[PDB]
RNA sequence: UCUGGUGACUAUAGCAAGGAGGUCACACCUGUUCCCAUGCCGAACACAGAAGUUAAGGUCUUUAGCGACGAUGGUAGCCAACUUACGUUCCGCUAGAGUAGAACGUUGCCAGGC
RNA sequence: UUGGCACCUCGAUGUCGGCUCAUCGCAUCCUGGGGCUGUAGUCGGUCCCAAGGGUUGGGCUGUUCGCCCAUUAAAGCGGUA
RNA sequence: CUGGGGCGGUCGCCUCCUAAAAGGUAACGGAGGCGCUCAAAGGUUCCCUCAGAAUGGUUGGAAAUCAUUCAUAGAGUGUAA
RNA sequence: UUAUUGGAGGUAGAGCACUGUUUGGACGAGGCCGAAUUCAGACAAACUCCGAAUGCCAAUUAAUUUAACUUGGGAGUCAGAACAUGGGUGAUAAGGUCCGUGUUCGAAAGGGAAACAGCCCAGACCACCAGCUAAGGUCCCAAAAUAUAUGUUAAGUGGAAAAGGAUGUGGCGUUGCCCAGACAACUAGUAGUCGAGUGACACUGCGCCGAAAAUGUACCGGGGCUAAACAUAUUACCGAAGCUGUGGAUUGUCCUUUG
């Protein structure tokens, strides 16, 4: 019931909505991390800002 | 007379075409005395439905049990590869 | 370097702003404009009165709902209750 | 020289030349058909120049139709003018073929004859073609 | 339950055909002195009436032939990703239109009398 | 070649023909080698491989281009601001 | 204004399309109008339903009146859509 | 921004019921070729009985983060450009012009694309002779595999062009000819004698020709490659001013036991 997110690819050169989602998870620059409780509000966002993030557990 | 299929496990993805490279063809069944079960018959024996009656007729298939007395309802014949995909079945009851 | 033909028309009108001006669900006030058209694409319902062939506007307070009551016609009502 | 009699407005756009064919890709009339497989235009003068070459090899024997009647106009602005004062007048007509739709249907012929005659008119067209016979 | 009056339900309810009756209730007719009136005519509107008639209207029971609604599977398009200058492929979500399986000859509120 | 677009140059990038001098492609004009001819021979048509070398003197107009005279084995087509 | 300029044509309002299923959105892109009219073609209360297609009937436009039947809007709305 | 529900509108697609355009069959409508309708098919920016993906306004909705708005001083811009896609104009011509919508440059240095504002990764506070990794690569110039396994091509294709032409070469499928003995070859004018394959199609990967331009090879960047090329998978390693390790910088928040 936990997920930790990791931003692997960078954020420049991606259109204006996906660059605006990736701070709402709390990531701020590359190779950062944030630990978030599992929630179907969360796991809809990482569907949109997939192909960037590396998740686990 | 000569047909067989597996009950095609549902919610298949859009990788359904890389098994159409092998000579399969998806199909569903209808009918009075049935419920709508997607089947996966291989078209290698569909040079052997012309070889029984032609188009209008009856041939059973046996997806486990209950080999339905069926009839070929419709094609989806897409040319440029000269093949058939998504034929359909219909019981007579 | 040859004299090219004359165009004929150009000449557009200006614009008018049409369409919905409030939306399904929110809270409106008794003078506001719901929808407006050059015809009748949305009939009025209860507590909504027409204008001069335009501007379906709410009579009194409440929230708005869109609704159909025929096979093609559509209407707008406002219920003050909450 | 097949033309439309009446046309609503004489200066129109150009069709979206992508995608598959709409329909009409099953032969209905003849026994033998000729369909296309690449995506060009035909300009209302091929379609008669593929009709006169077709007729004479069969010596006007069996039935032959066409299936592609050109509807759309297309305009070419006159000889070497600068850009922009309005569209030019029409000069021909056109009907866009998608890949995989039938051009010609022939009947009243054996197989070994008509398969020659479709080839001799396939070189009069600016498209790639492929023989076909009544999907059954 | 059934007949009538007024409601809601996207024609699944309607037209198209066919058979059944009575008027305790609608009609059909009997007329125009009056109420009223046809740019004319009491066919219609209204009024005065009840000997006839179920043929018609409306009611009821069958027929899926006319329209209408309509699923599962597909294919085209397509937001996101990848590759590439090809009238492109490939992968991951949503998902029709036509066409077939068919459902369908209405449903239910409240009144007054059986 | 005739154009289309306006990207560099207006605190100047001199513009047509001709003389002087060349240099480079080959889609070859002569010469060298072949196939094929509805090629008797001598001539001739057409096509392939080939740049090594040759490619004229005058009248006319500013001319380019062009026609015309007399020859020659031939009087090639082009790029190089 | 201007695919450099004069030349030709344009200069404000109204309606579509282009315009990419909210609104918006250009070009010397494609099509049309207006610079008013109506004392009733405005307000109200009642009542009626169409152009056509047949079928016959003094006059016959093919069609100017009359009836009958099948007509869901295929007519009409002073003016362009 | 995201899930949930409810909504507005008619594009891509589809379709012919609507105004319009169409080629075929029978259908009537004079005294030897034509005049309404009906069946089977098609077309559309100004044709829609239908009709999605996405975006767009609102939930007094719940999760995560950091904005938003009102007023008052100070401006600068109103010459944009290339890519990726939906379009008009142009000739489905341009490094063209004109709109939508994104990115980057402008105003951004580094690494790759041989060099190269606009493409591909990624955002530089400064130091160090420290480690992992992205895009592209791994015989030499030049850091890293002459890695592993299956195949393919024999042209320098890789390392710039189509219509067409063709017993090139592979894995694929169907079918008719068959020790009764063909298809190669002999001798007859009825056709005999020779002992292992032959034709048609059907779909595909990789090739060849078609292929001519101007100082000098002349689009591999060069050397050079028959694997150092293409396809298919699996493994490490190099690879930036990215991220970490570490030293001190200036400002802000929070502890504030002033670290
Ligand atoms: Mg009477
Ligand atoms: Mg030039
Ligand atoms: Mg410009
Ligand atoms: Mg200056
Ligand atoms: Mg100077
Ligand atoms: Mg000077
Ligand atoms: Mg040569
Ligand atoms: Mg020379
Ligand atoms: Mg002299
Ligand atoms: Mg000008
Ligand atoms: Mg819009
Ligand atoms: Mg379309
Ligand atoms: Mg379009
Ligand atoms: Mg362009
Ligand atoms: Mg732009
Ligand atoms: Mg920036
Ligand atoms: Mg470099
Ligand atoms: Mg070096
Ligand atoms: Mg530090």
mmCIF file of C-alpha atoms (C1' of nucleotides) in Angstrom, chain C residues 20 23-26 35 42 65-66 74, chain H residues 6-10 50 57-60:
data_model
loop_
_atom_site.group_PDB
_atom_site.id
_atom_site.type_symbol
_atom_site.label_atom_id
_atom_site.label_comp_id
_atom_site.label_asym_id
_atom_site.label_seq_id
_atom_site.Cartn_x
_atom_site.Cartn_y
_atom_site.Cartn_z
ATOM 1 C CA UNK C 20 -23.312 27.812 -23.610
ATOM 2 C CA UNK C 23 -22.735 24.787 -17.475
ATOM 3 C CA UNK C 24 -24.493 21.811 -15.900
ATOM 4 C CA UNK C 25 -24.350 21.808 -12.145
ATOM 5 C CA UNK C 26 -23.132 25.143 -10.823
ATOM 6 C CA UNK C 35 -27.562 29.697 -23.328
ATOM 7 C CA UNK C 42 -32.641 24.599 -26.762
ATOM 8 C CA UNK C 65 -29.933 21.110 -15.279
ATOM 9 C CA UNK C 66 -30.018 20.180 -18.937
ATOM 10 C CA UNK C 74 -33.869 19.674 -25.275
ATOM 11 C "C1'" G H 6 -23.461 14.990 -14.981
ATOM 12 C "C1'" G H 7 -23.030 18.310 -19.503
ATOM 13 C "C1'" A H 8 -22.403 21.639 -23.919
ATOM 14 C "C1'" G H 9 -21.058 20.672 -29.638
ATOM 15 C "C1'" G H 10 -21.538 17.690 -34.942
ATOM 16 C "C1'" C H 50 -25.870 8.517 -37.268
ATOM 17 C "C1'" C H 57 -17.044 24.802 -18.349
ATOM 18 C "C1'" A H 58 -19.124 22.955 -13.148
ATOM 19 C "C1'" A H 59 -19.053 19.680 -8.933
ATOM 20 C "C1'" U H 60 -19.725 23.723 -1.450
#
